[PDB]
Design a protein around this nucleic acid. Structure first.
Lengths: 255, 255
DNA sequence: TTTCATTGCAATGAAA
DNA sequence: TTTCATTGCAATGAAA
């Protein structure tokens, strides 16, 4: 299908992404910040067991690495919405308070959609998978996001940290949005006729005709794969005249 | 003393007042009002006994009279501040809500005092006793303020009401202030040099010299007695250069 | 687990 | 006794 034509663009077949054109990110601290070390809260075995496979997988992917850092924040066991599956959720609030603020450049959905003309009725919606993880973290900034991990069988001494932009970090959405904007700048230039809306990891491609939407989508997927990002094939809405984007149902230029 | 020179002006020796020049007051109801009859709440014997002498005294003074009225509000036993003496307090709130509003013409103490020049350093302060009771209530408006009274030994069938402006009636302060202003208009004309401040029942006479304050005070007392009002001799502050008025301590034109 | 904020209302005070 | 309003905080929800 569209899946076979772009094996590298889909998370299903391209493997975990890595934005190769983006320099590892350095995270500036506020002028007065010093490391904060919050001890990990005791976790039930059920919670630890539920979370273990995820840490192992991230460790195998190299997204997490062992470390020793004066910084440390709590790992919280959080059951998926109503479900009984545990998911690791780092409380990075004390770290966020010590990181220098940046201007929020992500447009709110409402204003973003205003840039959608009635002429472009053919849409493609793509969701980038593990977007933040595609952006490398500079070695100097990695220690900042450390947390403790007590092994299952055996493995880690104590602390682990991220080598990619983390979930829970106040500036992750904005930094991802800006980096993807830089990586897709050229694409916008090569396709003056297409309408591309970016909302962090949620992308919408607007075209005038089914052919343009198809040709445009091929190029976009091709480009995304080459840059190192990965779109979810499962969720992909390709060349439809009716799509769901950012909580809206688009059709007939309405909404 | 000053007491003997004006027997009729002092509450101590002039008997209960009655503003003879003021026509009995008619109290206009709002366009949609109908009588409200709130049943009297059961009262302990202690409360009833504590309050009894006051009703009897008001009945003897003719300030209260028997009646039958479609209106009725509760009589509350209220102990004097921390003391164990009971005092009758009528809850006229439902009546107040049905009476047509009037413009509040009583000045707040702050603005009132601003009309006190530094030239007049000699002050006399008089407190009118049972001020509201000095103003008659027109027979047509009396029924409005009725309440129930269960006798001690014997006496009253059920309801009693006021023949004078009542405590607890939202418009009593303003109506008294305006009536006294009308009754003292002439006095202000005959004494252009004196400063007279009126705050409901609290009066302040300001003069330039001790003689003027003494002569002025004589005239004021004389006039008040003839009009039917009564000042408290016990509280009277006559021709002092330092007096307490409306919570302030006046001296050297300060405050 | 903590933190931060929205909500709701019990508790206490004033007054007629 | 009732009513009206100021205060305070317990309860519940969101989030990292």
């Amino acid at each position: 299908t569209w899946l076979s034509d772009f094996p590298q663009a889909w998370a299903e077949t391209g493997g975990m992404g890595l934005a190769v054109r983006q320099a590892p990110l350095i995270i500036p601290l506020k002028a007065t910040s010093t490391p904060v070390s919050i001890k990990q809260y005791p976790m039930s075995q059920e919670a630890r067991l539920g979370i273990k496979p995820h840490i192992q997988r991230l460790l195998d992917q190299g997204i997490l690495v062992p470390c020793q850092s004066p910084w440390n924040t709590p790992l919280l066991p959080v059951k998926k919405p109503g479900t009984n599956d545990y998911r690791p959720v780092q409380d990075l609030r004390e770290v966020n308070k010590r990181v220098e603020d940046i201007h929020p450049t992500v447009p709110n959905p409402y204003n973003l959609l205003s840039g959608l003309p009635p002429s472009h009725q053919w849409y493609t919606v793509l969701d980038l998978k593990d977007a933040f993880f595609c952006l490398r973290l500079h070695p100097t900034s990695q220690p900042l996001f450390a947390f403790e991990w007590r092994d299952p069988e055996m493995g880690i001494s104590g602390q682990l940290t991220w080598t990619r932009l983390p979930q829970g970090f106040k500036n992750s959405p904005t930094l991802f949005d800006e980096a993807l904007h830089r990586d897709l700048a050229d694409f916008r230039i090569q396709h003056p006729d297409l309408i591309l809306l970016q909302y962090v990891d949620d992308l919408l491609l607007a075209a005038t005709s089914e052919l343009d939407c198809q040709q445009g989508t091929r190029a976009l997927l091709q480009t995304l794969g080459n840059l190192g990002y990965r779109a979810s094939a499962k969720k992909a809405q390709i060349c439809q005249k009716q799509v769901k984007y950012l909580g809206y149902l688009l059709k007939e230029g309405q909404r």
